[PDB]
Amino acid sequence: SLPACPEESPLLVGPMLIEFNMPVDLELVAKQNPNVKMGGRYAPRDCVSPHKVAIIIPFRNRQEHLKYWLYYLHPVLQRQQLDYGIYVINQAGDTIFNRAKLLNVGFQEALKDYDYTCFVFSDVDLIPMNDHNAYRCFSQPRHISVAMDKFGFSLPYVQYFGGVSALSKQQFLTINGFPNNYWGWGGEDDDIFNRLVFRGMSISRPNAVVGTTRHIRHSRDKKNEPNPQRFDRIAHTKETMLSDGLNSLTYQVLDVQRYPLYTQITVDIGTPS
């Protein structure tokens, strides 16, 4: 009988220095994080966390960003005293990218590993600047990346729900997960915001200082061009969410790799139907 972890972690140091211009060596990060177990799993040795968190990263062709992510997050997530695992959902193939479908795959496959009850959905190029910005679930859906540098350290609009967010297992199931048919860039986070509002929820957020986040500057990805149907799509979420999401999801996992600091699920999610 380990006792419960304190409600807020005593380990946190607050604001942090973040930079992206040095090389990163994941063997060395592994050695700096000796307590992270194979597949990027950690829980505290001294107490039991109520936070059973799968962190889900949609991914293709961003290995350099991913090493920064893992270098910065792993120490922060342990200081937060979370029982967590990292999942990188790698889109097989070279056709148009589908962020939100990959996120659904992540939810469904992490559940096969462990009784996770919280899901964090994080883009791979967003790093929090303050470890008081909690990477776990709340009684309402949680928007985490609230004051990104690239939007002037505030929200680009008050209904913005992109970047990094957290939903409990019950919140995600309540909205039928995320939509599967936003192919290419834009709009799927707005649809997900729509979904939560249509199911009676509201967005919880840390303050702008605690929520300061850095984005790793990068040029445009090929095969994730702006989706021209995105404006039409987000205008119909209430109706389309009933039968587009978790209850219409299929995919084929091609490969699961347990690396020391993460599990990578390589997955064929198809093209538009």
Ligand X SMILES: CC(=O)N[C@H]1[C@H](OC[C@H]2O[C@@H](O[C@H]3[C@H](O)[C@@H](O)[C@H](O)O[C@@H]3CO)[C@H](O)[C@@H](O[C@@H]3O[C@H](CO)[C@@H](O)[C@H](O)[C@H]3NC(C)=O)[C@H]2O)O[C@H](CO)[C@@H](O)[C@@H]1O
Ligand Y SMILES: O=c1ccn([C@@H]2O[C@H](COP(=O)(O)OP(=O)(O)O)[C@@H](O)[C@H]2O)c(=O)[nH]1
- Where on the chain is the footprint of Mn ion (CB under 5 A)? 125
> Do 232 and 144 contact (CB within 8 A), yes or no?
no
Q: Which of 39, 42, 59, 203 binds ligand Y (CB under 6 A)?
A: 59
234 contributes a contact to ligand X by CB under 6 A: yes
CB of 250 to ligand Y, least distance (A): 21
How many chain residues are in contact with ligand Y, going by CB under 6 A? 15
CA atoms within 13 A on the CB side of 116: 30
Q: Please report whether residue 221 would count as binding ligand Y according to CB under 6 A.
A: yes
Of the pair 61, 252, the CB lying nearest ligand Y is at 61
Q: Which two tokens stand for residue 113?
A: 């590993």
HEC letters along 97-156: CCHHHHHHHHHHHHHHHCCCCEEEEECCCEEECECCCCCCCCCCCEECCCEEHHHCCECC
Asked if 123 is part of the footprint of ligand X (rule: CB under 6 A), the reply reads no
Give backbone dihedrals phi and psi of 232, rounded to 5 degrees, phi first: -65, -45
Question: Which stretches within 42-98 are classed as H helix?
Answer: 63-79
What string marks each residue from 137 to 156 as x (binds ligand X by CB under 6 A) or -?
-------------x-----x
Residue 153: both structure tokens together: 């350290």
Check residue 162 for interaction with ligand X (CB under 6 A): yes
Give the nearest distance from C-beta 135 to Mn ion in angstroms: 18
Binding mask 180-199 for ligand X (x = CB under 6 A): ------xx-xx---------
User: Under rule CB under 6 A, which residues in 104-133 are in contact with ligand Y?
Assistant: 123-125
Name residues whose C-beta falls within 8 Å of residue 65's C-beta, 6 or more positions apart in sequence: 124, 125, 216, 218
- Encoded tokens for 9: 């972690």
- Counting contacts by CB under 6 A, is residue 100 touching ligand X? no
Q: Which does 220 bind (CB under 5 to 8 A by kind): Mn ion, ligand X, ligand Y, none?
A: ligand Y
Q: Which residues bind ligand Y (CB under 6 A)?
A: 57-62, 97, 99, 123-125, 185, 220-221, 224
